[PDB]
Amino acid sequence: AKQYKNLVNGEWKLSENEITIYAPATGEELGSVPAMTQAEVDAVYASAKKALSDWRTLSYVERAAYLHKAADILVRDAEKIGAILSKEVAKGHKAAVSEVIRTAEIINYAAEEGLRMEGEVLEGGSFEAASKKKIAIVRREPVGLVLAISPFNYPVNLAGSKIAPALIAGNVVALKPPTQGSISGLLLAEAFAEAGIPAGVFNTITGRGSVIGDYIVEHEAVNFINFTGSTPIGEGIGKLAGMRPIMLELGGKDSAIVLEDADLALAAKNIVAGAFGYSGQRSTAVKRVLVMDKVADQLAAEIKTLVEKLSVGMPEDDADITPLIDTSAADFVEGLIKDATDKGATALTAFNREGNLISPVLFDHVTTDMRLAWEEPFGPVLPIIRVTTVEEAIKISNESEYGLQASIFTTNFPKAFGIAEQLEVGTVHLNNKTQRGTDNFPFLGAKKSGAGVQGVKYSIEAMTTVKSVVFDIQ
Amino acid sequence: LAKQYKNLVNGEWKLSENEITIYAPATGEELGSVPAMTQAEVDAVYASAKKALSDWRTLSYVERAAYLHKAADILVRDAEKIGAILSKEVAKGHKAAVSEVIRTAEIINYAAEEGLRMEGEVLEGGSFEAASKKKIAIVRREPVGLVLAISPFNYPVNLAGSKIAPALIAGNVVALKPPTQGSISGLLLAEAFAEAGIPAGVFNTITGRGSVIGDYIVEHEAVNFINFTGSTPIGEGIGKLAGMRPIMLELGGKDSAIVLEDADLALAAKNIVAGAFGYSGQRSTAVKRVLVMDKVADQLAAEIKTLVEKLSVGMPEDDADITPLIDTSAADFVEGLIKDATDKGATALTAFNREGNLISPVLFDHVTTDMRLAWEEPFGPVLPIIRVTTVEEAIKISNESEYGLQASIFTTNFPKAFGIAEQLEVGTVHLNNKTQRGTDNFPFLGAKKSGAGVQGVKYSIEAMTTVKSVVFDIQ
Amino acid sequence: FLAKQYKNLVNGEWKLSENEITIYAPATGEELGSVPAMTQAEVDAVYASAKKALSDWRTLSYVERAAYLHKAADILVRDAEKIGAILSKEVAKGHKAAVSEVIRTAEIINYAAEEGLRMEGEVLEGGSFEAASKKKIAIVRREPVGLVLAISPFNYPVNLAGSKIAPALIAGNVVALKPPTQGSISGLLLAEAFAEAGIPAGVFNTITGRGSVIGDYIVEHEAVNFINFTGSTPIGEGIGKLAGMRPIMLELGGKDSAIVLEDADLALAAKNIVAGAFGYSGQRSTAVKRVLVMDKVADQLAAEIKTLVEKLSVGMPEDDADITPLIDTSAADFVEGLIKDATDKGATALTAFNREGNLISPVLFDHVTTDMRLAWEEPFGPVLPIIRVTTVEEAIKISNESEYGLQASIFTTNFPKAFGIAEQLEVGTVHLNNKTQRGTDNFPFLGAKKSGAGVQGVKYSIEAMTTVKSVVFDIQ
Amino acid sequence: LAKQYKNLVNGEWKLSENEITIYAPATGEELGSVPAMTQAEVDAVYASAKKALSDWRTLSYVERAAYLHKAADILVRDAEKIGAILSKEVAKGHKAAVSEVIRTAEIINYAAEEGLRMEGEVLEGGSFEAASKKKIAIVRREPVGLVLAISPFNYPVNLAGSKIAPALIAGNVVALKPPTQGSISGLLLAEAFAEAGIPAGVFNTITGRGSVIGDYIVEHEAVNFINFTGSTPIGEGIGKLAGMRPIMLELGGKDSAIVLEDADLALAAKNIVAGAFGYSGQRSTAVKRVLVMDKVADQLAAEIKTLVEKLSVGMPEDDADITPLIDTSAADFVEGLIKDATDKGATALTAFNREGNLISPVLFDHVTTDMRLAWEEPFGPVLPIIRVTTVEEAIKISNESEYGLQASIFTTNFPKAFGIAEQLEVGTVHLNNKTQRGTDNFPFLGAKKSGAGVQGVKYSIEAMTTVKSVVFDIQ
Numbered sequence A: 001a002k003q004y005k006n007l008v009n010g011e012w013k014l015s016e017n018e019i020t021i022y023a024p025a026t027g028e029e030l031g032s033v034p035a036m037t038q039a040e041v042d043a044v045y046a047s048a049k050k051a052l053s054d055w056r057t058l059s060y061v062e063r064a065a066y067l068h069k070a071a072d073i074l075v076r077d078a079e080k081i082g083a084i085l086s087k088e089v090a091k092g093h094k095a096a097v098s099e100v101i102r103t104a105e106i107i108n109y110a111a112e113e114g115l116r117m118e119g120e121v122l123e124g125g126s127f128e129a130a131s132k133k134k135i136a137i138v139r140r141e142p143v144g145l146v147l148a149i150s151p152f153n154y155p156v157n158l159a160g161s162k163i164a165p166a167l168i169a170g171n172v173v174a175l176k177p178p179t180q181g182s183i184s185g186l187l188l189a190e191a192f193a194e195a196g197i198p199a200g201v202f203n204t205i206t207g208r209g210s211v212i213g214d215y216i217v218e219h220e221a222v223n224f225i226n227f228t229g230s231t232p233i234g235e236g237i238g239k240l241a242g243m244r245p246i247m248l249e250l251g252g253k254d255s256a257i258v259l260e261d262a263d264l265a266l267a268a269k270n271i272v273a274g275a276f277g278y279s280g281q282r283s284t285a286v287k288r289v290l291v292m293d294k295v296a297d298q299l300a301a302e303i304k305t306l307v308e309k310l311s312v313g314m315p316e317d318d319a320d321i322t323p324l325i326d327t328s329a330a331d332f333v334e335g336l337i338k339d340a341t342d343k344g345a346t347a348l349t350a351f352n353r354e355g356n357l358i359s360p361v362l363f364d365h366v367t368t369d370m371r372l373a374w375e376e377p378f379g380p381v382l383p384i385i386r387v388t389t390v391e392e393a394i395k396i397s398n399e400s401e402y403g404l405q406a407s408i409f410t411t412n413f414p415k416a417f418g419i420a421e422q423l424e425v426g427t428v429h430l431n432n433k434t435q436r437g438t439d440n441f442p443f444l445g446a447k448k449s450g451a452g453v454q455g456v457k458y459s460i461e462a463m464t465t466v467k468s469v470v471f472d473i474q
Numbered sequence B, D: 001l002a003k004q005y006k007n008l009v010n011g012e013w014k015l016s017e018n019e020i021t022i023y024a025p026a027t028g029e030e031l032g033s034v035p036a037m038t039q040a041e042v043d044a045v046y047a048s049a050k051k052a053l054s055d056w057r058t059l060s061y062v063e064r065a066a067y068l069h070k071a072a073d074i075l076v077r078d079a080e081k082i083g084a085i086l087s088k089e090v091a092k093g094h095k096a097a098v099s100e101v102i103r104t105a106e107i108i109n110y111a112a113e114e115g116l117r118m119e120g121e122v123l124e125g126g127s128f129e130a131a132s133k134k135k136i137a138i139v140r141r142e143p144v145g146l147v148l149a150i151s152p153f154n155y156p157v158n159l160a161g162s163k164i165a166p167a168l169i170a171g172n173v174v175a176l177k178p179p180t181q182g183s184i185s186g187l188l189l190a191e192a193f194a195e196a197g198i199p200a201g202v203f204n205t206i207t208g209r210g211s212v213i214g215d216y217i218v219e220h221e222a223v224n225f226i227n228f229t230g231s232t233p234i235g236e237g238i239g240k241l242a243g244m245r246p247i248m249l250e251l252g253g254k255d256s257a258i259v260l261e262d263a264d265l266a267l268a269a270k271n272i273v274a275g276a277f278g279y280s281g282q283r284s285t286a287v288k289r290v291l292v293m294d295k296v297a298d299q300l301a302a303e304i305k306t307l308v309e310k311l312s313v314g315m316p317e318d319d320a321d322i323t324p325l326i327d328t329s330a331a332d333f334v335e336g337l338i339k340d341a342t343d344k345g346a347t348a349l350t351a352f353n354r355e356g357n358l359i360s361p362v363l364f365d366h367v368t369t370d371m372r373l374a375w376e377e378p379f380g381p382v383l384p385i386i387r388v389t390t391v392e393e394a395i396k397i398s399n400e401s402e403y404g405l406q407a408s409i410f411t412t413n414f415p416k417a418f419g420i421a422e423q424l425e426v427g428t429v430h431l432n433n434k435t436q437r438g439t440d441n442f443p444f445l446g447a448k449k450s451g452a453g454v455q456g457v458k459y460s461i462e463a464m465t466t467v468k469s470v471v472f473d474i475q
Numbered sequence C: 001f002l003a004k005q006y007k008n009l010v011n012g013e014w015k016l017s018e019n020e021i022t023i024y025a026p027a028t029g030e031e032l033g034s035v036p037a038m039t040q041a042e043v044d045a046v047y048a049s050a051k052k053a054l055s056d057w058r059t060l061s062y063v064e065r066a067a068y069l070h071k072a073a074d075i076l077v078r079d080a081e082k083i084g085a086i087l088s089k090e091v092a093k094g095h096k097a098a099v100s101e102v103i104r105t106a107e108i109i110n111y112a113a114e115e116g117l118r119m120e121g122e123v124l125e126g127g128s129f130e131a132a133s134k135k136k137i138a139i140v141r142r143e144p145v146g147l148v149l150a151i152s153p154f155n156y157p158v159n160l161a162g163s164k165i166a167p168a169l170i171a172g173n174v175v176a177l178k179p180p181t182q183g184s185i186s187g188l189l190l191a192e193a194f195a196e197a198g199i200p201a202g203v204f205n206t207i208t209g210r211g212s213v214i215g216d217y218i219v220e221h222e223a224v225n226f227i228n229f230t231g232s233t234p235i236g237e238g239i240g241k242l243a244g245m246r247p248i249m250l251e252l253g254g255k256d257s258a259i260v261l262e263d264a265d266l267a268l269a270a271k272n273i274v275a276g277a278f279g280y281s282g283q284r285s286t287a288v289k290r291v292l293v294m295d296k297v298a299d300q301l302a303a304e305i306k307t308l309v310e311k312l313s314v315g316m317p318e319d320d321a322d323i324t325p326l327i328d329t330s331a332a333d334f335v336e337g338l339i340k341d342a343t344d345k346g347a348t349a350l351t352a353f354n355r356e357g358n359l360i361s362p363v364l365f366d367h368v369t370t371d372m373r374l375a376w377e378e379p380f381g382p383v384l385p386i387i388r389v390t391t392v393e394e395a396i397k398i399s400n401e402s403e404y405g406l407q408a409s410i411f412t413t414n415f416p417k418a419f420g421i422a423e424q425l426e427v428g429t430v431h432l433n434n435k436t437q438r439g440t441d442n443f444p445f446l447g448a449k450k451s452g453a454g455v456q457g458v459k460y461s462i463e464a465m466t467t468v469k470s471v472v473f474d475i476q
Ligand SMILES: NC(=O)c1ccc[n+]([C@@H]2O[C@H](COP(=O)([O-])OP(=O)(O)OC[C@H]3O[C@@H](n4cnc5c(N)ncnc54)[C@H](OP(=O)(O)O)[C@@H]3O)[C@@H](O)[C@H]2O)c1
Pocket: A149, A150, A151, A152, A153, A154, A158, A176, A177, A178, A179, A180, A207, A208, A209, A210, A212, A213, A214, A217, A228, A229, A230, A231, A233, A234, A236, A249, A250, A251, A252, A282, A283, A284, A376, A378
């Protein structure tokens, strides 16, 4: 264990108060993180706005060089960081190391994407003959101070996915990690500090989101809020933003649509991998199967066999299903499972709970009257909902308040493309599970799944504006 | 003559039980009445739009463009007829009002052709991860859905069409809420789209005073996007009611004209006067404050003065440069700014005079930062000259404004001007010319309280679309 | 009815030459009119006029250049029946198909005007590459290449003239159109529309004449900055020998394969194959010219295709027959020789060969093998071979063994597999479950290998005929 | 000492039965030998490349970029080792030669990252016709195939890497033919790619005598694209052999520096001398004629003279500004241009001297356009000053050249400079700076006899890629 500190203006600062963090799978004390005051928040933001000018006037290639160095340090320390990340969020050890490696990949890719963004030269004579000698030189500029707020389930990857695109464009950044996950966020900050990031260009803030969360968001030093987390918290940020630009990555209830001509064993393989990864604690993850009646019995059997084979255990043993993040999360999941059983759903795999380790539960004959048909569990439970027509599958899929991603399993690709056009989601994966990657692809959600478009180049465009200089050629 | 106007709702023209009478600001002549819609009538507009969306988005781009081209041709045909009423309704010079209609047709046509050739992206998984080299993402644009377009009094046709046409080409459905003062002109624009045969519900209008109906139309869950041009306080309120939904806001401006020691003063004076006093200063992009190096301030002020004195002051029907302001409260607000500036010691190079709401153009010199006129947007024919001692002071005063729409720099050192422009917190910097929204293909955006989002034709199309990514593995 | 003496457009005037070429309708021998037989000195005058006009033309706004193109398109629509009627006779194209060609030409001209007028430049940052250059920016704007020589083909003498002229003109180039001799009347009728639209003198000009007098001369001339050619592979190869350092675009021959897998919709494959293969009697570079069909479905597919080939009408252009007389006797002789080689080597004639004059009835062969000329050579006539293959790998191998690489069709219900096949096909475009085709004209059109060079389709053609001018300075 | 070098052929290092001994132009020192390949050995290079193409083009972008980054890291590691030999081989200053190698690594790394994130596009049939609204075209990038890259003696590593890396990232395979003088440097570059693990046959080298394989290399049917830098007459020969294969040509220049009456004359002189006399004038991009308004010509000429007199003249190992020219014929040619200018009455402001092939830097004033030096590319250290009385005359004289690579304009009036730039028949105009190829992300191209095609990193990648379209109908 150890006492961690926030990065503030190039200096590691403790706070009067602190919060102790324990491993959710064991209760092991992992350390403590500062509990920041509002004056300490003000100082973070003040140093950031002070460093902005010297940072934005650096060349793109100099800013990229800092990001590449930080990524190299993360790769070097992937095992040491991952070992702690695995404990802090009860994620499989290997999966935690992989998250660190993927973060380095995103940081490097953002550095090189951001140093070659488009600038435009527009001709007045495209619109009006009298203006044929007038041209507009349009160049991108940073928005200023970006507040990045990462979630517990990817506390390093979904911090880096915000930090690096912001920094390459010339923004300064403050990272508010989740409390459960704050040690991992501060370990990420260490890599940026060692890389030599100029004082104040990147800073961290730790403290209970339920105490300082509103304060850090409504502070007028913040020019942009980039948030990943729960839908209700995101909704609140959408109000406190006013006219300030934002990005919200919220909940999902991704549907896997399985048509009569699908490869059922292949559909089952992708569905189980996607639904039960990290115990279902992922926004982009198959959370409901909408399967045509004729093949539903066969598909359910294929899924059941796979779910029964999943390992259920501790993070150190790289179990497929690990303990959920906290007791409230496990209670909520158990509640959803109980509601489905009470309303008559068929439990194809057996429920069991030891501490907060819930064994994976597959339900068949789930109906739209059951909470599990709609609510995001963030736990290892998966409903199968039988449908009679493609039209009905589309209707049920779109009736969700969420619209992150969908999967379509079928051998008729032109038809699948037509269905994809009708689904109110950001991304449709054909014959594969839903996923955020690859990280160059757009990542976005409709409806209550959030706002804005991420993926690397899209994230950079979001956290920049344009400056147009217009003049007349003689 | 004075006609009773109706809203376009699901392809039909509909009256309401209550209406609003509209008078010409320059004469008091009654021009007609427009409906005062109920919340239930708004619900019907939105329901018809959402019902029409599926069949509209499934048309080809070229079919949607054909409707817009036909609407634009009708506007050109009726430009004189529409311009004459627009001129009376907002007290805009007759020829300028006809020009607004012609420009609207140009924007509609340009948006139709820009939007039909918007294309998508194919992204390679192998750009990022070797194991994903057979995975590609087919990324195509889609409409956001129902766009609520809210236009302002000063360009009630042009800044309606600048929202409607980009929205429609992309496959969105649209409800237009014009300004009450300007609602007749907005409904005249709607007639063109109806005559072009726009399918029922694809384009609709809503009228009923923003002070009464504005909050309900914005909060309504049917609306997927809000595209607003108007005052900063109204824009802020819309920002709150939008929640997570995308919005575009084009709000107030206090554009600075920075005049350096090496500037051509005759040309700077010409551009400053044209920009500051166009439409009596009732433009968000007007030159609204001169920041001039002291060593050229006396001669610049004198050359501006000579031009201000030559401006005609009269009625819209006579194509006067300075026409009566939109309403009495607007003229009172401008008079108050003039009074404040005079009380604090500014020099009135031209004399204040007011007959009804026709204020003569007032040029002030020696304006200081303690005067309201240095900061607040007047929306009237008054221009302050603020003297600075260094270019750094000009940058600081320019950026101290809460507004950040555009700026002008007058100088003969362009490399230095480019470096100045990089530091100005605005969307667009014009070198050796007045600020202006055009040409309409160029980006138009404002920093700080001047709004959110980027317009100009292609940018407005991109704003009112989202993307749909379809990912698959090649075998 | 009344044959006319036609003239070239040269510097805004209509000019005869001392000698001329009489053009006869291939289907009937009817004298249609004459076009000038220009001398090298007259070519010089065309090019001198063009280079003189280039200054005032490239400096116009995009809006002003676009207006001329839109007006020319409007005139073509107005005169589509009049122009199509003569085009039909000149190249023995069905009357309705010739009118359709004119209408399609107006569509491409209008689309090119609107595509080109909104093209943009870019601004690049020195600091993307080196910190010391962070204040250096490059303002990069588009410019024309100069004088474009556009050479159109007999089989689309209007459409594939307009596909070159309009992209060139919107970008600020000046243009000289050399139509094919058989097709020169149609090209000069197109020129009349641009002249009536008010195209400034010398901005657009025409050249007609004999290859033996001016053929190489028009291409080698130093005034020409770009050559844009559609025609046969051997003529294209010659233009490559004479192009030197100047950019060119070549749209040459094809032998497009239609790969029909076991899981294909065979009725749909047959319908598309026959439409693509026999349109304009097979006188198209983009056209199904060989069926590569998996053994298990070959009998069924052959029967479907046979039925549709038998329904094709064979006759005169005025009667809108599907199969019209070929462009000349040499072309028909060449086609007959390919048919005889296949017959003598044991291919099965599923429909009967007949020839009257240069009117060849449509011939479908089954059991064609790679030792037969018809497996490889582009006929430009109404003959189609079916080649039975055992695997998709063999279909890919045989398809890619061709010296041509224009397009391919894949008929299958497995699209992810079809994409994997398309990646291996050495062609410009692969159509899934559809015949090969140039359209829609916004899509890229290009040929690999001996099928051409460069990428057309509207925006791609404008890109090819534009360069850039960069202005670089340091911000202070 | 002097080593026998080998060609990289299908992952193996191959001598040939005959070789070419390479000597240092400044000293006569034997540097080593390169193989004199036969036509059958060229066949083996090309067969190896075409066999490697299938597995190379189907690797992921990231895998291809990783090889390029590794090659660049090795070049940086070995920059002195390679640069020291490059310096001797082409009589380039030692520091400049090492810097060339470093710049090559920068270009290789930048090309890898530019190329790996290239994208395809999806086009809508409904943009063009309603009946095709369900038809989409998935357009993806593909390599052209085998690129023949021919580097120049004056940048035998940098302008090899500028072709190789853009080709490779896009999935092309490459054969590099260095010039004989400059073949050792080319083979040293190849060693870096081989050590980086470039797969066998993906990158190969050809060396030999023109009399044996010169035309054969270019005419060979395996070659799909020719990318050449060199002299105009040699490039003209390549053009006569390209057939239908796409080419790119970077040929000669006669860049003008136009100096107007308001120019900063000290800045102009500094840039003019740096650009004109770098590498003894043996650069295609380099100020080669000053076109100066007569009112400022005396002062400009004096400022240039003072700088030219400071230039060091001597050996490559001593980083002399002016080193010996590439061979005797080149120096003879330059001496002839100098003599013609002297005999026709130009003023020699600095003195001509020749020792071996080391020519001292010669600045001429009062050059008239009947002098060969006004027009012919010298590739030697001689600079004419031509006085004009109007900008229009400067433009005419500039454009009268058969060359059109770059131009410089020195003036404080940028809107005017931009208008002049529009009229100059060149690829790039630099304002208040010498002409230069960099930064390497910017476009680099020549008009007229200066070449064909657009380079600079992303432009070079575009040039060596084509597309494959897959079109289907949505259901
Ligand atoms: N779409 C995506 O890409 C994505 C990815 C991952 C997760 N998610 C979603 O996020 C949810 C799970 O994440 P979570 O449990 O960490 O969410 P959460 O409880 O909303 O917390 C998210 C983050 O916001 C902070 N926060 C809490 N209250 C705040 C406030 N009032 N103002 C500002 N910030 C505040 C939290 O700090 P504290 O920890 O101190 O409360 C934490 O750092 C699920 O709904 C999941 O679908 C989405």
